[PDB]
Amino acid sequence: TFVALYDYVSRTETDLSFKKGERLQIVNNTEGDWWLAHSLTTGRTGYIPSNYVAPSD
């Protein structure tokens, strides 16, 4: 479980848009430093830039 440190606006049809503070579960790293993530906050799933999140405490 990770937390968003920034907002992120989707730039592709498979990205996940998220707000700062959202809690995310990492599904896989099938896009490299782009991770497939599921937002516990919104229920959506999509790719995120891994440098925009950090582990939940």
Binding site: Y6, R11, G32, D33, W34, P49, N51, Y52
Partner: peptide
């Protein structure tokens, strides 16, 4: 914000 990684 930091730069987006290459995809």
């Amino acid at each position: 914000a930091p730069p987006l990684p290459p995809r």
